[PDB]
Amino acid sequence: GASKLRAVLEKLKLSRDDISTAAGMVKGVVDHLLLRLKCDSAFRGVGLLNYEHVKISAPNEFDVMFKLEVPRIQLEEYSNTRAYYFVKFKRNPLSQFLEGEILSASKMLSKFRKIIKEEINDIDVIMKRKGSPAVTLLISEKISVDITLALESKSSWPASTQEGLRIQNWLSAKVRKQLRLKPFYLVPKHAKGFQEETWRLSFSHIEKEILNNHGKSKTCCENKEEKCCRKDCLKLMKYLLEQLKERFKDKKHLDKFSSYHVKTAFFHVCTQNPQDSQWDRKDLGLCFDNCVTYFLQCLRTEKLENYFIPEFNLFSSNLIDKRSKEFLTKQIEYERNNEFPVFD
Numbered sequence: 510g511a512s513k514l515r516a517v518l519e520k521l522k523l524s525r526d527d528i529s530t531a532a533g534m535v536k537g538v539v540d541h542l543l544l545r546l547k548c549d550s551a552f553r554g555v556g557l558l559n560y561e562h563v564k565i566s567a568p569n570e571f572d573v574m575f576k577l578e579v580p581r582i583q584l585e586e587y588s589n590t591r592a593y594y595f596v597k598f599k600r601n602p603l604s605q606f607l608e609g610e611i612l613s614a615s616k617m618l619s620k621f622r623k624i625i626k627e628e629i630n631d632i633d634v635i636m637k638r639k640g641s642p643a644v645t646l647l648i649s650e651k652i653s654v655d656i657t658l659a660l661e662s663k664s665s666w667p668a669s670t671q672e673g674l675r676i677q678n679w680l681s682a683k684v685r686k687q688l689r690l691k692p693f694y695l696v697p698k699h700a701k702g703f704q705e706e707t708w709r710l711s712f713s714h715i716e717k718e719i720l721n722n723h724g725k726s727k728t729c730c731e732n733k734e735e736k737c738c739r740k741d742c743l744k745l746m747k748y749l750l751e752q753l754k755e756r757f758k759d760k761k762h763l764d765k766f767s768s769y770h771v772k773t774a775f776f777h778v779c780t781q782n783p784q785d786s787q788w789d790r791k792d793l794g795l796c797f798d799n800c801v802t803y804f805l806q807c808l809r810t811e812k813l814e815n816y817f818i819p820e821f822n823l824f825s826s827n828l829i830d831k832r833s834k835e836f837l838t839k840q841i842e843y844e845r846n847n848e849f850p851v852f853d
């Protein structure tokens with residue numbers, strides 16, 4: 510059924526051609542928002558990080574990160590979670606959001622939301638409150654934009670990342686060092702009621718960079734000889750999960766699975782298969798099959814290390830229970846045995 514996979518990819522490309530216009534609407538609203546926000550003393554250095562689509566099958570649902578540099582940050586890991594932190598300061602335009610020594614995600618979300626509500630009120634845009642994403646904008650008839658606030662730190666990545674991003678045999682030890690000199694991000698995100706002043710690490714910019722500059726060869730996919738199917742494999746994996754989540758929206762079994770699980774699984778497969786010749790475009794069928802198989806193996810063993818924080822198990826039974834993983838395992842295996850009927 511490799512041809513059927515290409516059929517899917519054809520459809521997905523069409524949907525992207527016919528959304529350029531929507532992305533224009535989004536850029537205009539977002540540019541407006543950023544100008545107003547930059548006049549607030551708290552948000553003076555607000556900017557775009559890189560739009561993106563968390564759901565490949567939802568072309569009108571956009572996703573945008575507003576970054577804000579926080580100099581001289583000091584992090585305090587929450588409860589050995591490796592991914593969630595309290596934000597302190599070494600020595601402040603954010604001082605108004607302090608709860609004691611801690612930058613309050615609650616308060617900084619409050620103001621972020623207030624200001625956005627103001628500007629939307631002045632513009633045919635409508636808003637709705639969602640911590641990350643913080644708000645959802647309705648633009649025109651059927652365009653949504655989730656906006657995440659993200660603190661930026663130009664300091665060294667936290668200790669939990671020391672053994673992560675194991676790209677050395679694939680993208681190289683040089684690239685790994687360059688990427689770890691880039692900043693990292695913190696999004697407001699409560700941890701399990703719930704600890705309500707934690708911030709979670711975010712490496713979405715690094716994920717973006719790897720996906721778009723993904724070969725061992727620097728010229729991978731820039732000529733006929735070197736076309737690979739890495740990006741097509743990830744698209745197919747995302748579309749598979751999205752179709753299944755839609756199909757079983759009435760069950761609780763697939764609610765905790767997201768595109769981040771699929772994308773994490775994929776990067777692990779890139780690590781296991783570092784040579785570009787292992788991703789020949791002519792081998793799309795077996796390449797996707799081997800991505801599907803890897804994700805399934807993560808499901809059955811309940812092991813999916815965060816690609817950047819290897820001690821963080823995305824498939825822990827504290828996060829997703831065994832029954833849910835077994836259901837998804839059964840459904841994917843059915844799809845794969847039947848040439849993926851869910852695609853149509």
Ligand SMILES: Cc1nn(-c2nc3c(F)cc(F)cc3s2)c(O)c1C(c1ccccc1C(=O)O)c1c(C)nn(-c2nc3c(F)cc(F)cc3s2)c1O
Nearest residue numbers: 563572592641642657710711712751754767768769815821
């Ligand atoms: C990737 C993703 N996909 N997805 C869906 N996919 C589907 C789908 F496929 C079908 C469907 F119907 C519905 C959805 S929604 C989603 O919501 C996300 C969220 C996200 C998207 C947009 C705004 C905010 C969030 C957010 O919550 O932060 C997301 C992001 C971008 N990063 N991230 C993590 N990064 C780290 C990390 F760096 C370290 C660590 F230890 C843990 C984590 S977790 C995470 O969880």
Ligand SMILES: [Zn+2]
Nearest residue numbers: 724729730737
């Ligand atoms: Zn390539």
